[PDB]
């Protein structure tokens, strides 16, 4: 359902009156402006496209400026799309704010995780290292065996090997929301979220709930 796009400011803690420390992640959720509304006639689906501002003018190409000229007249870092469920809320130039999350108790939070680049075995798939002494010859972090024998005569698909790790979108699936403060574009959620500081993320009410 309708969600918002925010930036990861960092992590901190909140102390409650009952002596409990809650670790929270600060998400800056500025105003999101609707730039386009998809419907079932022109497109085959009902959704809305939104943007968050703070983009310079000389870096906006003519196609993007023309796209924004549709009652948005304000460029943003990028465009995101949210599938629109029932309700049929006002769409064009509505400028949804963080107040939308003033009643929800759970959020999913999607973002691009930190990029390791190398992964490597052991670190990527929690493989067990072979021994370090007792003769081991140049085989400590190596994977080991990758196939049975002549009978299969090959290596199966999906075999766990060394490659790229991180730098891919991940969801956290129903985090808890602690505080939603207005006049500051802030949303505090318990726990950690994927990505580094200053990275963009998509906050969306939990579907499991």
């Amino acid at each position: 359902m309708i969600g918002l796009v925010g930036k990861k400011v960092g992590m901190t803690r909140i102390f409650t009156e009952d002596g409990v420390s809650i670790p929270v992640t600060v998400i800056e959720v500025e105003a999101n402006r609707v730039t386009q509304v998809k419907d079932l006639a022109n497109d085959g689906y009902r959704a809305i496209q939104v943007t968050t501002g703070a983009k310079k003018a000389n870096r906006v190409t003519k196609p993007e400026a023309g796209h924004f000229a549709k009652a948005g007249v304000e460029a943003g870092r990028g465009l995101w799309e949210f599938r629109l469920a029932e309700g049929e809320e006002f769409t064009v130039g509505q400028s949804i704010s963080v107040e939308l999350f003033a009643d929800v108790k759970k959020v999913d939070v999607t973002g691009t995780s930190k990029g390791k680049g190398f992964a490597g075995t052991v670190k990527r798939w929690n493989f067990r290292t072979q021994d370090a002494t007792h003769g081991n010859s140049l085989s400590h972090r190596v994977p080991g065996s990758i196939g049975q024998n002549q009978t299969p005569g090959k290596v199966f698909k999906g075999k766990k090997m060394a490659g790229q790790m991180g730098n891919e979108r991940v969801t956290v699936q129903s985090l808890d929301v602690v505080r939603v403060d207005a006049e500051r574009n802030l949303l505090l959620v318990k726990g950690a979220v994927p990505g580094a500081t200053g990275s963009d993320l998509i906050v969306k009410p939990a579907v499991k709930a």
Binding site: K114, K116, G117, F118
Partner: protein
């Protein structure tokens, strides 16, 4: 992995790197212009400009610190007497780098690095 780290190894150990940067800083202070590789100059900036900032203020303790970090009375004296007042009112950016092609022996990118005032 390297995340938010600074300083490059130059394929050397710490002691060799420190000695090389000390010698290069002394040479740059003495000659006001030198020919070196681009990464080496980019690293030498962070070693040489702080010395000029330290020399901005003259005191016995600052002289001792500069001598600890350079180990050459000649260039220490050139500081606090010539390079101090020459900049004085300039806030950072005492050196500039200019690419100057490649080196014949190994095709390494080369660059001049020199003080901005250029002895004028």
């Amino acid at each position: 992995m390297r995340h938010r780290k600074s300083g490059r190894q130059l394929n050397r150990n710490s002691s060799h790197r420190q000695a090389m940067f000390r010698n290069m800083a002394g040479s740059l202070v003495r000659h006001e212009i030198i020919k070196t590789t681009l990464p080496k100059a980019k690293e030498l900036r962070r070693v040489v400009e702080p010395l000029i900032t330290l020399a901005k203020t003259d005191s016995v303790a600052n002289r001792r610190l500069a001598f600890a970090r350079t180990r050459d009375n000649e260039i220490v004296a050139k500081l606090f007497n010539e390079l101090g007042p020459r900049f004085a009112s300039r806030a950072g950016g005492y050196t500039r780098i200019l690419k100057c092609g490649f080196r014949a022996g190994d095709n390494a990118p080369m660059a001049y690095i020199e003080l901005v005032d250029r002895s004028e």
